[PDB]
Amino acid sequence: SYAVAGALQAAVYQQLRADAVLAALVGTAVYDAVPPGPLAGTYVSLGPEDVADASDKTGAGAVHDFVISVITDAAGFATAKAAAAAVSDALVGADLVLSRGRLVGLWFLRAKARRVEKADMRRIDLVFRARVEG
């Protein structure tokens, strides 16, 4: 998107699947591309960001408002909350390492939670603001 967005999704994927919680609560089912197979059904997904172009005369940066959705096949979605709670416990104030530039603050934004389809699957989006500096 902006130049940092190649490295940002890579590093927030690496801070995920390293937290001990959400590894005993989701498992290995944290991905962007879905591994085809049986579709385990309590995964998360980390793809849709958008940029709010916060830049400079000398240099330029980006505000990545990336969405991490939590999808859950369970009957209620109290299961999907603690998995999303372990997302938000892992990412606000992250201070991680990027491959192009660095980020300065990984804050938290709106996080809606609803039934996507036939009321069988439950989507909890979690928008995180990622002010990165190129």
Binding site: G61, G93, V104, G105, R131, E133
Partner: protein, 130 residues
């Protein structure tokens, strides 16, 4: 660039963060003592510079959360003092000057949080840790 969370104003009790600090702002000032004379190359305004006094002011707002140091800001205002305050720029470093507690105000609504502004101003000589 720096994180907004890293720059923090703090009271003494040894310095701790005041609990709710959603928005904070150190602000420096000078009054620009004018020294204009008849003979000027283009008639441009002439200023002495260094002689004029200089200021600092802190305005930190956010949610009223009771802490041991939030009660300290009550104690500084009622018993009138000029204690040491410290706003740390994320890269620059701390400031460590004596400020006072010029105006504080607690506010709450029928559906919102209990919130406060905490406005401060310099009361003595400042510093810079680099």
């Amino acid at each position: 660039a720096q994180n907004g969370k890293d720059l923090l104003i703090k009271l003494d009790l040894q310095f701790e963060t005041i609990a709710g600090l959603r928005a904070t702002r150190i602000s420096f000032n000078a009054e620009t003592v004018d020294v204009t004379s008849l003979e000027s190359q283009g008639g441009w305004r002439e200023l002495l510079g260094g002689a004029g006094v200089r200021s600092a002011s802190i305005s930190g707002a956010g949610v009223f959360k009771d802490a041991d140091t939030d009660e300290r800001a009550r104690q500084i205002f009622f018993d009138g003092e000029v204690p040491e305050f410290q706003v740390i720029i994320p890269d620059f470093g701390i400031v460590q000057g004596p400020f006072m507690i010029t105006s504080i105000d607690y506010a709450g609504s029928h559906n919102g949080e209990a919130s406060y502004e905490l406005a401060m101003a310099s009361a003595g000589a400042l510093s810079f840790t680099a």
